[PDB]
Amino acid sequence: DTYKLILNGXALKGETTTEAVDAATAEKVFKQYANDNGVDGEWTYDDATKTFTVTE
């Protein structure tokens, strides 16, 4: 299924997606995406909409 990540670094905000087999596998992809783009901090997950957020 399609999973979504909403990043908030502060000034820079964005949204990416990933096609993953389960929520844990999307989470791993998103965690390394966030780190590679300078956003590190507070995570959330909305199971009903397959949506993660990470906020600096």
Residue numbers in the entry: 1 to 56
Paper text:
Thus, we chose to engineer the loop L1 of the 56-residue immunoglobulin-binding domain B1 of the streptococcal protein G (GB1).35–38 The solvent exposed loop L1 in wild type GB1 is a type-I β-turn with lysine at the i + 1 position and threonine at the i + 2 position that lacks a COi+1 → COi+2 n → π* interaction. However, to have a better control over the turn conformation, we decided to introduce a type-II′ β-turn. Through subsequent X-ray crystallography and computational analysis of synthetic GB1 proteins with amino acid substitutions at the i + 2 residue of the β-turn, we show that amino acid side-chain identity and its rotameric conformation have a direct influence on the strength of an n → π* interaction. Gratifyingly, the thermal denaturation of the GB1 proteins shows a good correlation between their stability and the strength of an n → π* interaction at the β-turn.
Our earlier results indicated that the β-branched amino acid d-Val at the i + 1 site stabilizes a type-II′ β-turn more than d-Ala. Thus, we synthesized 2, with d-Val–l-Ala in loop L1, which readily crystallized and X-ray diffraction data were collected to a maximum resolution of 1.9 Å. The structure of 2 overlaps closely with the tertiary structure of GB1 (backbone RMSD 0.39 Å), although with a significant displacement of loop L1. Gratifyingly, the d-Val COi+1 and l-Ala COi+2 in the type-II′ β-turn engage in an n → π* interaction, where the torsion angles of l-Ala at the i + 2 site (ϕ, ψ = −59.7°, −42.2°) are remarkably close to the mean torsion angles of a right-handed α-helix (ϕ, ψ = −62°, −41°)42. Thus, to obtain a quantitative estimate of the n → π* interaction energy (En→π*) at the i + 2 residue in 2, 3, and 4, we resorted to NBO analysis, which clearly indicated a decreasing En→π* in the order 2 > 3 > 4. The Ramachandran plot of the i + 2 residue in the type-II′ β-turn of 2, 3, 4, and 5 revealed that, as the strength of the n → π* interaction increases, the torsion angles of an amino acid in a non-helical region in the absence of the stabilizing intramolecular hydrogen bond are gradually altered to occupy the right-handed α-helical region. Therefore, we chose to substitute the solvent exposed COi+1 in the type-II′ β-turn of 2 by CSi+1. Thus, towards the synthesis of i + 1 thionated GB1 (d-Valt–l-Ala; 2a) (the thionated residue is denoted by superscript “t”), we obtained a clean 46-mer polypeptide up to the l-Alai+2. However, on completion of the 56-mer 2a on a solid support, following the acidolytic removal of protecting groups, the mass spectrum corresponded to a 45-mer fragment without the l-Alai+2.
